[PDB]
Amino acid sequence: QAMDSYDPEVRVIDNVGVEDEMPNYCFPLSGVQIGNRSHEVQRNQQQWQN
Amino acid sequence: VANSDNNYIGKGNLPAMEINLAANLWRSFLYSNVALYLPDNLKFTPHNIQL
């Protein structure tokens, strides 16, 4: 005893739309997207040396 | 090996990006259903637009 049925939202398509106001932005495993390296730099007298 | 230089072999695990679907859905729900209906005294007009 399982009455045949159709999904009411499938029979009549109530195209209310999508509640998409917020973007999503899938992010990489690493939090900073590992790439080229950089050198630490400190000022010694007036210029910048590595 | 002769004329066998068209391989596209990678190393390690597959590259990918996380998206955290559960919090994405939940935060979109709260924004679009509660934050948008906040009283006008808690909403700001964006810059460089006229109302």
Side-chain angles (χ1 to χ4, degrees):
Chain A
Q1 276 194 24
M3 193 59 219
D4 312 77
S5 301
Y6 53 80
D7 186 74
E9 293 83 3
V10 175
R11 185 65 160 123
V12 286
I13 308 181
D14 62 358
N15 210 320
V16 176
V18 295
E19 307 172 343
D20 55 344
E21 275 101 340
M22 211 175 88
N24 304 130
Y25 304 135
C26 71
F27 286 109
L29 275 296
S30 66
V32 293
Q33 188 274 330
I34 311 297
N36 44 307
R37 270 86 76 81
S38 67
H39 319 284
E40 193 175 356
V41 172
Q42 59 191 358
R43 173 205 292 297
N44 294 26
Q45 56 270 10
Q46 193 34 30
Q47 67 156 351
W48 299 97
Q49 293 84 300
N50 293 14
Chain B
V1 186
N3 51 53
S4 173
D5 306 318
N6 288 346
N7 302 300
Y8 290 102
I9 291 152
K11 268 189 301 307
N13 306 325
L14 265 56
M17 291 146 178
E18 300 215 3
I19 196 183
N20 196 289
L21 294 174
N24 278 25
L25 275 297
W26 181 236
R27 187 176 134 87
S28 181
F29 168 93
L30 281 71
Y31 179 71
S32 189
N33 291 8
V34 189
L36 268 185
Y37 292 90
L38 283 169
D40 197 30
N41 63 7
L42 310 155
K43 321 174 74 185
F44 84 114
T45 180
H47 42 57
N48 302 145
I49 203 170
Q50 283 304 50
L51 306 178

